[PDB]
Amino acid sequence: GDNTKWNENQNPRMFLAMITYITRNQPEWFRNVLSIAPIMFSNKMARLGKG
Amino acid sequence: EMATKADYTLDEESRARIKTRLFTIRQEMASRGLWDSFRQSERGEETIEER
Ligand SMILES: [Mg+2]
Ligand SMILES: [Mg+2]
Numbered sequence: 001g002d003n004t005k006w007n008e009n010q011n012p013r014m015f016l017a018m019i020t021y022i023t024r025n026q027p028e029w030f031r032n033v034l035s036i037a038p039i040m041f042s043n044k045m046a047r048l049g050k051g
Numbered sequence: 052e053m054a055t056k057a058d059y060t061l062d063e064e065s066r067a068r069i070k071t072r073l074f075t076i077r078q079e080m081a082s083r084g085l086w087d088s089f090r091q092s093e094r095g096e097e098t099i100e101e102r
Contacts, residue, residue: 029101 012041 016038023031052059052066059066080086 027101 012038012044016042 016035019034019038020031023034052070054060061069077086080089
């Protein structure tokens, strides 16, 4: 089996949910520093290129 | 003060200078009412908290 459009359907919000469940009962600084990447990817911009 | 085998490597006048600087600093502290918490801040400052 292959999965189709894998990267285009992987949502950063679900990565944030996964990281939040994985880092339960951890120090809060650790959860924050692990949560920043899904947040930044949820608000990301794609540069269009050369034109 | 204390020292291993009571061998204060320095002499009386230099240790007196050190003690005079410490006393001056502590009284400068108590002038601004800062000494109490600083005195009670020793049992935790060998533990580095991440923020
Ligand atoms: Mg395959
Ligand atoms: Mg393929």
